[PDB]
Backbone as CSV, one residue per row, in Angstrom:
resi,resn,N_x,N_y,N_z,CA_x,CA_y,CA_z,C_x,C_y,C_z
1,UNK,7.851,-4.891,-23.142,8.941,-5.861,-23.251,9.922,-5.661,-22.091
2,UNK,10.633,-4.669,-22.762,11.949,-4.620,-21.381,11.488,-3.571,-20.182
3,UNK,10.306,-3.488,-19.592,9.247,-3.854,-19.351,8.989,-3.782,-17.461
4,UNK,8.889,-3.080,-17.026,8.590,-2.712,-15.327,7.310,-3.990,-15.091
5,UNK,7.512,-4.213,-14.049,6.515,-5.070,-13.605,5.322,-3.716,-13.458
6,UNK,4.068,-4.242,-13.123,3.254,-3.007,-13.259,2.409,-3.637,-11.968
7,UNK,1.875,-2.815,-10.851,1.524,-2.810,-9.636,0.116,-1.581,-9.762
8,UNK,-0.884,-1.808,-9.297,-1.682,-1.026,-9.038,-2.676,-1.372,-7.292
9,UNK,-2.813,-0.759,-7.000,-3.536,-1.227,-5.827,-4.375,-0.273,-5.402
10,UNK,-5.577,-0.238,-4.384,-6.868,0.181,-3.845,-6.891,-0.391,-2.517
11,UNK,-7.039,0.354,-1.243,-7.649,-0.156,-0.216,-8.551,0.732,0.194
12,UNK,-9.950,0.234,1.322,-10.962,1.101,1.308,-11.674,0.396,2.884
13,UNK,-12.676,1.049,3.380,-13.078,0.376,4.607,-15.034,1.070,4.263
14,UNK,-15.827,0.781,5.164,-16.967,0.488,5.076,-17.170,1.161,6.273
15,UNK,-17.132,2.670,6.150,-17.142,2.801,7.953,-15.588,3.072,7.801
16,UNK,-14.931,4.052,8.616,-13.787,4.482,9.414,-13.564,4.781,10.513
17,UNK,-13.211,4.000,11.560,-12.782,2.566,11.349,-14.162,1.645,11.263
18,UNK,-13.623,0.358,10.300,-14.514,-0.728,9.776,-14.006,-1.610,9.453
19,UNK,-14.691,-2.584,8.667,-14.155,-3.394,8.030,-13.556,-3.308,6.968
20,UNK,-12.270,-3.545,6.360,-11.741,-2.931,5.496,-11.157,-3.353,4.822
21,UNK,-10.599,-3.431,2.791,-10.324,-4.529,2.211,-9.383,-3.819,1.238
22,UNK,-8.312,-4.948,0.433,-7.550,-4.133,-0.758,-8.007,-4.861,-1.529
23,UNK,-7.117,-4.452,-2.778,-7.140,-5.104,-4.317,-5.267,-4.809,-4.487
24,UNK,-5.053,-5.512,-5.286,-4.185,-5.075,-5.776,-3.678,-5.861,-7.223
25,UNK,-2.963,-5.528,-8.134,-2.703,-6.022,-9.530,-1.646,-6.081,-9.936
26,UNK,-0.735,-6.982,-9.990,0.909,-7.625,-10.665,0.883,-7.755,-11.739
27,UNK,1.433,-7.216,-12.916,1.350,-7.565,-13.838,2.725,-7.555,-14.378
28,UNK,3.270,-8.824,-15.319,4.774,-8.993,-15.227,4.881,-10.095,-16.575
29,UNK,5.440,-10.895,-16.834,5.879,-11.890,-17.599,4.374,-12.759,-18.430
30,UNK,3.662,-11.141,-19.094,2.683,-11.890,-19.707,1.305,-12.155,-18.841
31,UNK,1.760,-12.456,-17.480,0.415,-12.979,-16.489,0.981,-12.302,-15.691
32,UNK,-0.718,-11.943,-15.036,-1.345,-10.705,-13.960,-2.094,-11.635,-12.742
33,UNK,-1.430,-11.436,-11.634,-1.939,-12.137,-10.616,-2.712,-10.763,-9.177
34,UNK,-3.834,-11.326,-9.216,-4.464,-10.396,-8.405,-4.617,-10.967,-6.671
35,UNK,-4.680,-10.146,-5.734,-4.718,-10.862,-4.088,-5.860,-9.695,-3.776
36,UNK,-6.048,-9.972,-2.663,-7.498,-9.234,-2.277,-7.050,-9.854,-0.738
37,UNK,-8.087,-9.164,0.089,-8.025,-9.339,1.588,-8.965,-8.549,1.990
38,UNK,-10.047,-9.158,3.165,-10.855,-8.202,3.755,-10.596,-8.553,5.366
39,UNK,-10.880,-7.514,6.139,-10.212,-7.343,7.452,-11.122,-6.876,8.257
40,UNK,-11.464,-7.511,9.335,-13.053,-7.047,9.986,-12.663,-5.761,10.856
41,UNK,-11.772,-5.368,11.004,-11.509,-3.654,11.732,-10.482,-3.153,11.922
42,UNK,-10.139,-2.007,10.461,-8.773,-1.082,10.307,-9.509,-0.103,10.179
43,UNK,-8.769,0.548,8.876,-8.679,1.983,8.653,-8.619,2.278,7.499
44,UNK,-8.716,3.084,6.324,-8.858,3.352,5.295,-7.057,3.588,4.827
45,UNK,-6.787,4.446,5.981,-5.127,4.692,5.597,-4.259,3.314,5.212
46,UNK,-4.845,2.063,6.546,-4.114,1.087,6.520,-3.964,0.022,5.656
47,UNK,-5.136,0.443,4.738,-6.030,-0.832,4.233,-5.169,0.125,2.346
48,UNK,-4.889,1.316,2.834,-4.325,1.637,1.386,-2.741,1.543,1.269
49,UNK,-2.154,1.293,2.664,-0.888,0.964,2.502,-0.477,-0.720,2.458
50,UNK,-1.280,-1.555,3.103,-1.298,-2.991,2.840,-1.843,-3.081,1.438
51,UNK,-2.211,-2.609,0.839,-2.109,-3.020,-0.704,-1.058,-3.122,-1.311
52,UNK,0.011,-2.205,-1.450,0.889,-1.770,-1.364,1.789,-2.801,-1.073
53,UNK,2.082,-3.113,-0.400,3.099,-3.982,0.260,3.007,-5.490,0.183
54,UNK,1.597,-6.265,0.675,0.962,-7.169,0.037,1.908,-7.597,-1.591
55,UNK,1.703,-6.644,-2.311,2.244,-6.228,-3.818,3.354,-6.757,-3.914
56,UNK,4.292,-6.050,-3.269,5.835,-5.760,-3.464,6.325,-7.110,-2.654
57,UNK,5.977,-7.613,-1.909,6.313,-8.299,-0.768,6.131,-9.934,-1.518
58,UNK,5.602,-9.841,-2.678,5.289,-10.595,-3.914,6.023,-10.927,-4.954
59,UNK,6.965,-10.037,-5.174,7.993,-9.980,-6.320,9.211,-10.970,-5.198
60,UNK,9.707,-11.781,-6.351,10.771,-12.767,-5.389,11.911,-12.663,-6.283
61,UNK,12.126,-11.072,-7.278,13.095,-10.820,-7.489,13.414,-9.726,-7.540
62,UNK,14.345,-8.922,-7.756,14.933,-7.613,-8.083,13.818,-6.778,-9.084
63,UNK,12.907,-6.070,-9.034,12.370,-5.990,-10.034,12.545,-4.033,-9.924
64,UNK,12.048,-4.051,-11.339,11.906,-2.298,-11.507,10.314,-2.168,-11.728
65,UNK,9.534,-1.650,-10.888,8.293,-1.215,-10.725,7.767,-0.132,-10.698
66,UNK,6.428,-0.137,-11.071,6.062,1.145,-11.414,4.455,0.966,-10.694
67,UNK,4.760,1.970,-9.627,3.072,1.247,-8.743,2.126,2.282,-8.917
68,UNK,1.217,2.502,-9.245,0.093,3.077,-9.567,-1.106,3.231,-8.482
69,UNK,-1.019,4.435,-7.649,-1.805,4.214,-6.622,-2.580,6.106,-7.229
70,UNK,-3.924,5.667,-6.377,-4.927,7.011,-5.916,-4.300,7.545,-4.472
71,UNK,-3.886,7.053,-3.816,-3.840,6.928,-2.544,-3.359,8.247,-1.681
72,UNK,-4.117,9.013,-1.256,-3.619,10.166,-0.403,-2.144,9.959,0.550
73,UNK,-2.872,9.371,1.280,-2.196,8.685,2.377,-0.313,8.017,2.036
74,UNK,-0.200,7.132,0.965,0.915,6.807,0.341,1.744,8.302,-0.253
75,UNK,0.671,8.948,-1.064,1.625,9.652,-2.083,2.147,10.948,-0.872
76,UNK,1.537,11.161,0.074,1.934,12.585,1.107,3.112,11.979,1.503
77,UNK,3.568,10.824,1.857,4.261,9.854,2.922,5.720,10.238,2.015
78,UNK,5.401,9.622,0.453,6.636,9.454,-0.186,6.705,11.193,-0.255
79,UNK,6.377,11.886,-1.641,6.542,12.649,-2.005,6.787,13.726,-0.489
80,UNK,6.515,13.893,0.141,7.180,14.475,1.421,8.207,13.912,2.311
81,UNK,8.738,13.093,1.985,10.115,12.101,2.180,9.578,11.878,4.007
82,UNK,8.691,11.688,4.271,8.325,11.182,5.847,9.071,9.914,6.190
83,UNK,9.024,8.750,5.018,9.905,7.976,5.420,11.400,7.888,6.140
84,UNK,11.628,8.814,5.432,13.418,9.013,5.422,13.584,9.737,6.760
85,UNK,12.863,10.879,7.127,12.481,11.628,8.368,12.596,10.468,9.651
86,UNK,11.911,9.906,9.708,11.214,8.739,10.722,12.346,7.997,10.641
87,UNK,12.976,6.997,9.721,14.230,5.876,9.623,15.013,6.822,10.557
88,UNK,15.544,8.010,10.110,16.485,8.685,10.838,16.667,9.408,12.169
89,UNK,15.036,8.915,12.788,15.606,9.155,14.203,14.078,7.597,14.415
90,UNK,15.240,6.383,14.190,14.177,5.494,14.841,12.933,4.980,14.887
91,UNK,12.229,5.967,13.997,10.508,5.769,13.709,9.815,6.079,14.873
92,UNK,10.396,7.065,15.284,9.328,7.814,16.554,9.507,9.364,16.182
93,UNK,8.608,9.677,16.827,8.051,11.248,16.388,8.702,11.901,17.418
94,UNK,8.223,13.769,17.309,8.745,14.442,18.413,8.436,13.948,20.250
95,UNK,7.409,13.661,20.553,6.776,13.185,21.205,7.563,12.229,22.197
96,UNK,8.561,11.481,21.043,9.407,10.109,21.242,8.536,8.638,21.064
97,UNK,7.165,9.404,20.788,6.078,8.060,20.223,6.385,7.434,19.211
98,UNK,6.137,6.154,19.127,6.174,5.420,17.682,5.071,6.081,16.609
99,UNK,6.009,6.171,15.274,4.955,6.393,14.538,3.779,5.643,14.044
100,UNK,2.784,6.613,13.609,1.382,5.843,13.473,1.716,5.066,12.236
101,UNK,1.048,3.533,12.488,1.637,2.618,11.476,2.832,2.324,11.324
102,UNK,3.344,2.528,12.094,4.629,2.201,12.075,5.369,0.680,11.695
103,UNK,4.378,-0.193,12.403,4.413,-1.522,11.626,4.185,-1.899,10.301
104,UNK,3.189,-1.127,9.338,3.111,-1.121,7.718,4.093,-0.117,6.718
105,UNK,4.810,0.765,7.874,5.893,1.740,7.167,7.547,1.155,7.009
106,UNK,7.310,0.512,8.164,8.778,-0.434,8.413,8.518,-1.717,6.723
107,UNK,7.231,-2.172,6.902,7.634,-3.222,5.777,7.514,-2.984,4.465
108,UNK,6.705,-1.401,4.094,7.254,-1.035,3.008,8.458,-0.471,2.744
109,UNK,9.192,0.529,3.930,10.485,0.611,3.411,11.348,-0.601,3.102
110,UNK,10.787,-1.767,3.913,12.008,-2.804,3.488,12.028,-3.146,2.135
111,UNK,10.598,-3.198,1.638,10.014,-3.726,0.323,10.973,-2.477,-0.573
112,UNK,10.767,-1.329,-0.366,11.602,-0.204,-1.412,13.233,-0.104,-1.569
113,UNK,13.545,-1.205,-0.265,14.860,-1.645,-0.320,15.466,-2.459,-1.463
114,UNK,14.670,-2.817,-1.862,14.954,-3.912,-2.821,14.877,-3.810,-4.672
115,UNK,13.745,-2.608,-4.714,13.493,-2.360,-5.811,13.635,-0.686,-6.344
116,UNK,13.274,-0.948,-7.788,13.814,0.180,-8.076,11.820,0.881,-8.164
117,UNK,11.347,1.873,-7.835,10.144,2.103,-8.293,9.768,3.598,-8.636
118,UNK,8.854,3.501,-9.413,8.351,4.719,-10.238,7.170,4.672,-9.377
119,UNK,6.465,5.715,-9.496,5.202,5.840,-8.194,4.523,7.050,-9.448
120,UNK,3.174,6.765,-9.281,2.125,7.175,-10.753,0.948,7.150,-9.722
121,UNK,0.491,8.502,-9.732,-0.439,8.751,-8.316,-1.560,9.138,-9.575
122,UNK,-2.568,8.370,-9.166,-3.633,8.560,-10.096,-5.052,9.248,-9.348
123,UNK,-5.706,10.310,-10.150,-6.899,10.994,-9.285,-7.834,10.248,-10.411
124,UNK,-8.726,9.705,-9.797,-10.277,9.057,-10.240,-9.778,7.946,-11.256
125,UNK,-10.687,7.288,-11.572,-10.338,6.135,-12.420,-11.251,6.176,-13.175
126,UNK,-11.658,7.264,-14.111,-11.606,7.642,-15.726,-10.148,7.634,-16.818
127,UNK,-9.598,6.191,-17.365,-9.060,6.238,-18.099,-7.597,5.526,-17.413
128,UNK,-8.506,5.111,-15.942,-7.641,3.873,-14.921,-8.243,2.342,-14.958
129,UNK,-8.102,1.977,-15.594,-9.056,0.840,-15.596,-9.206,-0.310,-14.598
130,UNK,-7.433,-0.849,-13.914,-6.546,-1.598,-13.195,-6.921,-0.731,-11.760
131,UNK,-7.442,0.542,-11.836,-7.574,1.009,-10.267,-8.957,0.803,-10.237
132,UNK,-9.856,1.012,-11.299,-11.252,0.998,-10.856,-11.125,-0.205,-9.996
133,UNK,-10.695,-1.352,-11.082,-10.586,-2.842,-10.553,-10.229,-3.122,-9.057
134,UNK,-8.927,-2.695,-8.619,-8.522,-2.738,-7.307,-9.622,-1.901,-6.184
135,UNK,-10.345,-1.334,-7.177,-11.383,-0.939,-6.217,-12.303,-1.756,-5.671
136,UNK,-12.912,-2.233,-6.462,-13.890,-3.888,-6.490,-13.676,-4.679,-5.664
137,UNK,-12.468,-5.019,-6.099,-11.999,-6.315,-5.097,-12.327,-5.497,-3.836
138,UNK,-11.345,-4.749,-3.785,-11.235,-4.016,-2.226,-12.526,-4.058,-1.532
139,UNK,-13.826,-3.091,-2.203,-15.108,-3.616,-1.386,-15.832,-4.410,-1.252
140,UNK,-15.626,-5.304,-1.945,-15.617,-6.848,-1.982,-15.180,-7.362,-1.376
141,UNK,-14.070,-7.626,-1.088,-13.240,-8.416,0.145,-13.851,-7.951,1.514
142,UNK,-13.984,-6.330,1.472,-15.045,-5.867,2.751,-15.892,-6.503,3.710
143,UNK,-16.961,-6.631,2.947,-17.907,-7.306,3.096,-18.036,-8.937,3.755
144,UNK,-17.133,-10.036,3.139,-16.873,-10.934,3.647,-15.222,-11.281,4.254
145,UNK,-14.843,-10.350,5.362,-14.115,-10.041,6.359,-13.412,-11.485,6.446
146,UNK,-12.210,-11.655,6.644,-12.138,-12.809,7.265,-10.411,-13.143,8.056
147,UNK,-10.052,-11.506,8.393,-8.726,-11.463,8.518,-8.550,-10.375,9.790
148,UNK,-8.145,-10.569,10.830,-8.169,-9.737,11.847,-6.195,-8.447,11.481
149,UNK,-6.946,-7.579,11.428,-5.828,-6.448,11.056,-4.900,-5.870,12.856
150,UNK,-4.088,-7.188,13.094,-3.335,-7.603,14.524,-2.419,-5.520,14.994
151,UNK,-2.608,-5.111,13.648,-1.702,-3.765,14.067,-2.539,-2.567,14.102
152,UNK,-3.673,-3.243,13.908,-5.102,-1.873,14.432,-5.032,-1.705,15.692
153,UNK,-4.969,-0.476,16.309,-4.621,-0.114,17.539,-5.720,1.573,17.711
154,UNK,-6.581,0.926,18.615,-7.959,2.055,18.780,-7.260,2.989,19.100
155,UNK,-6.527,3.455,20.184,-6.459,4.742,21.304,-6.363,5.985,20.374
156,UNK,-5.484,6.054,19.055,-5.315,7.298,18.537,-5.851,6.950,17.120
């Protein structure tokens, strides 16, 4: 009832780097709206943070969320506050390089600007049912590619 919107998401690639696809799952006011995307050449990291965001970037109000990810890659980022690190000197590293992804980190912090969220890091999907799912889609969307991933960048 009084009631978090509920977010789950999966991204995955076929090959690293490959072709590579999410899932992801809204669930809010009774109805659950699902998006999917397959991308003829990212990354497994990238393809699990555009789920993610895809998501959030979805809600067209104030919402309190609770996102439900497997995701290595996401849960090291938050739970090691890397975000907050990076905002505070610019989003470049020691180096003075931009950080990697830096274009999918910028639009989830904006997205976390807005909402309030609970983060539920899930290992395997025995007793996940909404992640198996986001899995599906995800290698599904794989397969029939049809979205060029413009912030895939080979050199590193």
């Amino acid at each position: 009832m009084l009631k978090q919107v509920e977010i789950f998401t999966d991204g995955s690639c076929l090959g690293n780097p490959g072709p590579g696809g999410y899932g992801a799952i809204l669930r809010y006011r009774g109805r659950e709206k699902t998006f999917s995307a397959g991308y003829t050449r990212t990354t497994n990291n990238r393809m699990e943070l555009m789920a993610a965001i895809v998501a959030l970037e979805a809600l067209k109000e104030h919402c309190e969320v609770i996102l439900s990810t497997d995701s290595q890659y996401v849960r090291q980022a938050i739970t090691q506050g890397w975000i907050h690190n990076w905002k505070k000197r610019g989003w470049k590293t020691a180096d003075k390089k931009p950080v990697k992804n830096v274009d999918l980190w910028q639009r989830l912090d904006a997205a976390l600007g807005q909402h309030q969220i609970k983060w539920e890091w899930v290992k395997g999907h025995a007793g996940h049912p909404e992640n198996e799912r986001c899995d599906e889609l995800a290698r599904a969307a794989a397969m029939n590619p049809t979205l060029e991933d413009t912030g895939y960048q080979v050199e590193v």
